[PDB]
């Protein structure tokens, strides 16, 4: 998963 | 007891597979992302791509694209990481790692897989 | 990619000591919606796999010595250990989880004598 995709 | 456990060293030719195994225990999977990462003698970590334990969707690095397969098996609890046209310089330990969303860190590790391709 | 490097290279320090330990990233690891750098700090022994130390930059992981911090923001950031022991000689990475995965080179910590 990727850090920046964290909502 | 979260562990991690890999299948042993590997000898192998140039221009043959190998699959490697990480085998999973103590937590559920199916909240988890595996991911493979690589280490040659003397050099860094390196990426290889990671697997959604869940839905077993995968993202590979493009610098393995083509030749590497990342799979998982819900009922054996194992994740396995297939490299395909191996060359010396796949020459490596292979390590399993597992990640999740909201961590974004490894937390627990497999022991590493060493293995050798060499005529 | 991002692009993590780290310096310096190798750093050798009396028991005792500080080790000082950088790392940049090509662009910056912040998530402005959650706050969170996604830096981590990992330690490796031969024969062995990396140990996470520190995580999200500045966060200690369950177990790690009080003497490990980690600080720093956006592109830079750095790795300390306040008092050096012999446990501690090591390769250390940095690594970003922001976009993927980086590893930096790796610094190696010895003992000076």
């Known amino acids: 998963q990727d850090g920046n995709e964290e909502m | 007891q979260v562990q991690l456990v890999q299948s042993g060293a590997e000898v192998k030719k140039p221009g043959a597979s190998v699959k490697v195994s990480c085998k999973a225990s103590?937590?559920?999977?199916?909240?988890?992302?595996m991911h493979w990462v690589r280490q040659a003698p003397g050099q860094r970590l390196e990426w290889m791509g990671w697997?959604?334990?869940?839905?077993?969707?995968?993202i590979y690095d493009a610098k393995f694209q083509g030749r590497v397969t990342i799979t998982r098996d819900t009922s054996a609890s194992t994740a396995y990481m297939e490299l395909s046209s191996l060359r010396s310089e796949d020459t490596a330990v292979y390590y399993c790692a597992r990640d999740a969303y909201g961590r974004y860190f490894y937390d627990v590790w497999g022991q590493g897989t060493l293995v050798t391709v060499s005529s | 990619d991002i692009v993590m490097t780290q310096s310096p290279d190798s750093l050798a320090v009396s028991l005792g000591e500080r080790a000082t330990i950088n790392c940049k990233s090509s662009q910056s690891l912040l998530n402005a919606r959650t706050g969170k750098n996604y830096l981590a700090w990992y330690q490796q022994k031969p024969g062995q796999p990396p140990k996470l130390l520190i995580y999200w930059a500045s966060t200690r992981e369950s177990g790690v010595p009080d003497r490990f911090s980690g600080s720093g923001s956006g592109t830079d950031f750095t790795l300390t250990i306040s008092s050096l022991q012999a446990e501690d000689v090591a390769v250390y990475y940095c690594k970003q989880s922001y976009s993927r995965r980086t590893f930096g080179g790796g610094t190696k910590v010895e003992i000076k004598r």
């Open positions: 103590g937590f559920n999977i199916k909240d988890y992302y």
């Open positions: 697997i959604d334990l869940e839905n077993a969707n995968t």
